[PDB]
Symmetry: C2
Subunit: 358 residues, 2 copies
């Protein structure tokens, strides 16, 4: 092995893409050894992969020391755990305190944050307008992402390590474990509609129907993090990560209806946004019956879908981010966002989480 | 010489970029010989370049035959003349009728149209929504661009030639001859404001201030046309061409003010769009005095600026085009649109068409 990755959050959407992409033939930095850390016991999908799984609650300092301090060969840390204050800072500090003193060939720390935390719902002071670039200064408004950056900079600086900060847009992806996942949430809603013989009714705002939006494929995020981990010209940079294009929810919606073979009802002029979370609140038993009727992987509705997260997406606009910095540094990776969305639907079907198309 | 280009419209914004780019070291298809056709006598900027200049009114059939039929060595036609009905069709037909029977090693015809003709101001039948892709079918609405495509397909088909249709977004560029040029128009307005000690007052709509827009650098259009002219995998395709990013007029405006060292007045809530053409209607003499006072290249206001064209830009929105098709075919060329806009300002200054910054 040439390089040794510690993927913190391996069962998450991006973490699961890193485990796969790190193991492909001709991956930069390779051949890679991969340690994958997550709180749950190793999922069956990941047990069959060449990943060394470490079950660890990284919010527990002792346990993090016990399980990560023996891993002497780590060269690259990829901190990609979903970010839901002091707990996120503590988790990241735990990782760095447990590995930095023990891994004598440690080179680089990759920190994943996001363009916006929950679409900016928590952000008095006038915010920066879009298209979002990485050179925009920090505004005097508290931010959990800025607290993690500060720990990265301090710990990498003192220890002669390189750093990256990756700011993914809304992620399109799927793996057998990760929730707070937009495509899964929308596929679940489509599946319920189809089961109940109802149309795929758009519950969102006018503006989110018609505005330009962007996103990022989980695999592209993995490629971008690996690139910044191995390209010396890319190191010690804050870097956005999106698919390189724009889309509209209205087009995703039509595609979604088409893929499920159901009628669409788009935005209806004058009709106000309604909560998808509200529409779905009494559907937990319906979901149980769908799983049974279609022999799906048993999931609970609250585990596979986050309707509240779709609701925020559908009252958001003006959130486009730029890839000019990455491109000007030589990263020309992209995805067709419409093709990426469909590929996630296909993947959920292939893994039996939602019914087949026919 | 390996390849022999006939650049129809060499004094235009894209044509002048093709003449330059076709002559760079290590240009695909090279070394290129370049014939440049335009109606005016050879400009002094272009006389010093290794371009064989052909003065020709291509709307005159006889003259086109007289001047183009002796050019036996042409391999590639680049039809990039500005498109202002029967006249545009006739001009293109003239070119093909004059060259196809005479140029026995002719390979390829590149046809440049646009994403929209004059931002769609001439387009009953419900138009296609954006982001614009090349697979969207033709709608039963007359279109001068569709008439030129039809001639391309018919003439290339019958003669065993390959074709390309390039659909540039709004072009950012500058050369010493071309009008209907957005950056020039805005630099001229900025120059007048500065001369008169007034602020750079935005005269446009609210929506065009705040909406996402896109554009294309003239040099990137040249690179894209050359790529499709030489890459066999790219041939016989309709292909959009933009810089790969998005911007907003509000940000361009601030940049424009900054570059001229003048105060900005942005969009003012409640104030309706006013015509820039109207604001400038009695400025022809003012422009003469600015040229004199700053020793600029002598231009007439009506030749260097098209304020009406800026006015259309500033009541337009929802015109974003996709580069996914080109990227998926392996064309990864891009520009930072904000940097491209500034480079055009720099170029106009360098060539002495507008005053220096200080």
């Amino acid at each position: 092995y040439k390089s040794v990755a510690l993927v913190v959050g391996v069962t998450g959407i991006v973490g699961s893409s890193l485990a796969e992409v790190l193991k492909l033939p001709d991956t930069p930095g390779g051949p890679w050894k991969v340690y994958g850390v997550a709180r749950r016991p190793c999922p069956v999908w990941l047990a069959k992969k060449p990943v060394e799984y470490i079950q660890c609650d990284v919010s527990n300092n002792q346990e993090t020391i016990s399980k990560l301090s023996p891993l002497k060969d780590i060269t690259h840390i990829f901190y990609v755990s979903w970010i839901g204050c002091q707990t996120n800072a503590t988790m990241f500090k735990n990782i760095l305190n447990s590995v930095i003193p023990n891994a004598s060939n440690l080179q680089h720390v990759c920190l994943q944050t996001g363009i916006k935390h929950y679409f900016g719902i928590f952000e008095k002071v006038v915010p920066h307008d879009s298209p979002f670039t990485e050179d925009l200064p920090r505004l005097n408004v508290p931010n959990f992402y800025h607290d993690l950056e500060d720990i990265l900079y301090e710990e990498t600086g003192k220890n002669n390590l390189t750093w990256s900060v990756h700011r993914p847009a809304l992620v399109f992806g799927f793996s057998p474990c990760s929730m707070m996942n937009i495509v899964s949430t929308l596929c679940v809603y489509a599946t319920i509609c189809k089961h109940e013989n109802k149309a795929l009714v758009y519950p969102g705002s006018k503006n989110s129907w018609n505005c330009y939006a962007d996103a990022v494929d989980a695999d592209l995020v993995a490629e971008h993090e690996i690139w910044a981990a191995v390209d010396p010209k890319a190191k010690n940079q804050v870097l956005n990560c999106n698919n390189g294009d724009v889309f509209k929810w209205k087009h995703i919606w039509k595609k979604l209806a088409e893929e499920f073979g159901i009628e669409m009802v788009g935005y209806v002029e004058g009709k106000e946004q309604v909560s998808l979370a509200e529409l779905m609140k009494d559907k937990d038993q319906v979901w149980d019956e769908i799983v049974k009727k279609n022999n799906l992987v048993p999931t609970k509705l609250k585990e596979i879908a986050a309707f509240w997260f779709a609701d925020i997406a559908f009252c958001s606009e003006n959130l486009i981010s730029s890839m000019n910095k990455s491109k000007e540094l030589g990263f020309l990776g992209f995805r067709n966002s419409m093709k990426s969305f469909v590929s996630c639907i296909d993947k959920m079907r292939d893994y039996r989480f939602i019914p087949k198309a026919f």
